[PDB]
Symmetry: C2
């Protein structure tokens, strides 16, 4: 039983920051709760420790016709949501977003449609989430895999082998990009940036004292802005950027006194002017960990 | 017809940042939409310009037993919401939040209860909002009062004279505090800070290109943190602060290339140890405008 709902775009789920991905994550927790007969918000492991359904791999796919920067107050959307079986320790949640008028907004989720040929005018969200607990109270390092009792993955529809987010994130942690460096039609610019980012305790921290999943998207855009400025491009042009595809892998969290490093590089298209691929790696130098990788497929007019 | 709803605390509405006030503002727009027979999200003035139901005065009142820093993932709440007539150009929206178990969570909104003696264990939210339009496209200065056609304030219950948010915000713009400087039981410390804050285009900006109302709470906490650190207090102690009362007045918005100034001062209680009043003024020096005033009534254990 897929879920189909009418949404009107609110101030808390749009704009050039991370509010839309924050709202999508709330929707994911509601969708897993409904489909897996589990209260995700208050989940505890068999032993009684809180268990968080942590974001691990996050993709948002759009296009010139509908992307996250298209959305403004009062836009009417149709949202179709559903979970896919990834066993007892993980779960995949898909959301399709259409403009509520649109031809065929009533169509069900179509994996073929999500993994192979996304349609122009729809937005596609993939959230792969993993149950975790803390390994020590107040530590945000070395989180441990978990599963709350009664988590019902059984019955959920299955992905075919071709559609594996696991294959995708395994390659991205190795390559530090989601788009192979040897992919034709792009040139790697020499200009790169490295930004020191102390954890912002007033803006980066969630209600359980971890770094907030949506803050990782804010940190990647801070890196992307720093590279944009290194390229001599304007702050107003940054706000016109169209992100047609963004992938994020959350390899680690971090303690709230950490100083993170945000590294960014870009490949510009040889074929299409104003098209580029930006890669961002978030490091925690003091613990020697890479804690995130993101790739943004971007169209601009700077 | 007041609205009473069950809420489970989600990642997008808690934590030490501005997510709870962001969620409350979304709820306000839904409440005005329901009670005033108006689609606030897509509102336009009679002439066809977008009109925003802008936040102008915002209060959050709690206590040691339930405050915004109490809230964590999966907490079960009861929310009671309702609008009060302030004419065609403004509207007051109240929210009471109780823990869903609690004795007498079913009780209706009680102004006596909100303005005179708030109860321990309830959280009280006041949002006074004013319809505005831009005076020039792409300018965030010199916003103009408005009202969308068909806005139904008629029928809404009325406040008695004693309960005027107008008297409260008029005094705060004059004094740069919501708690009179001559109030007994407090001493003004000599330590103050002034922080330069360029508008953060990746975290401060909303879906219509204004500074986001919830970002004003992030900027006030940036000032408050800077003063806390000037006092030699610890970042971990900052995260244990209990804000029992916070008031915010939004006197202006600002263009996205602005450099703002965040000024903070504190009065410590003579009576109760670890109790203090922090005042923050946000200035836009280049336009010679004060664009916000906030006072935080805080309990700490630093
Ligand atoms: C719900 C929510 C979040 O999810 O925020 C956190 C964002 N995501 C994360 O912090 C996850 C970081 N990932 C990890 O900790 C690790 O990759 C996990 C999932 C534990 C896997 O650990 P591991 O790969 O080192 O070891 P394994 O062999 O995999 O076990 N939020 O902020 O509200
Ligand atoms: C919905 C939403 C917001 O409300 O964000 C903006 C936050 N609030 C504001 O920007 C409001 C700033 N206030 C003003 O612009 C002025 O005080 C207004 C309301 C126009 C009144 O102007 P004025 O006092 O100078 O002139 P008057 O005599 O009052 O007319 N958001 O971010 O999503």
């Amino acid at each position: 039983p897929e879920i189909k709902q009418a949404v009107t775009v609110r101030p808390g789920m749009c704009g050039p920051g991370s509010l839309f991905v924050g709202q999508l994550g709330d929707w994911t927790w509601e969708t897993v709760s409904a489909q897996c007969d589990t209260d995700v918000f208050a989940a505890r492991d068999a032993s009684g420790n809180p268990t968080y359904l942590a974001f691990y791999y996050f993709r948002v796919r759009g296009g010139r016709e509908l992307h996250p920067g298209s959305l403004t107050f009062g836009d009417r959307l149709t949202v179709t949501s559903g979970c896919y079986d990834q066993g007892t320790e993980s779960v995949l949640t898909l959301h399709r977003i259409d403009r509520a008028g649109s031809d065929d907004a009533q169509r069900p989720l179509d994996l073929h449609e999500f993994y192979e040929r996304p349609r122009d005018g729809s937005l596609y969200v993939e959230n792969f989430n993993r149950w975790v607990t803390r390994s020590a109270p107040g530590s945000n390092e070395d989180l441990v895999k978990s599963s709350p009792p009664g988590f019902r993955n059984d019955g959920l529809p299955q992905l075919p082998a071709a559609y594996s987010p696991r294959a995708v994130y395994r390659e991205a942690r190795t390559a530090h990009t989601f788009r192979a460096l040897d992919e034709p039609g792009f040139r790697l610019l020499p200009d790169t940036v490295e930004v020191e980012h102390p954890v912002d305790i007033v803006r980066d921290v969630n209600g359980v004292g971890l770094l907030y999943f949506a803050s990782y998207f804010s940190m990647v855009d801070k890196a992307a802005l720093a590279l944009w400025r290194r390229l001599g491009r304007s702050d107003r042009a940054f706000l016109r950027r169209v992100v047609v595809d963004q992938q994020m892998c959350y390899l680690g969290n971090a303690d709230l006194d950490s100083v993170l490093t945000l590294g960014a590089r870009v490949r510009v298209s040889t074929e299409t002017p104003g098209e580029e691929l930006v890669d961002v790696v978030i490091s925690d130098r003091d613990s020697g960990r890479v804690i995130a990788v993101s790739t943004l497929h971007t169209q601009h007019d700077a």
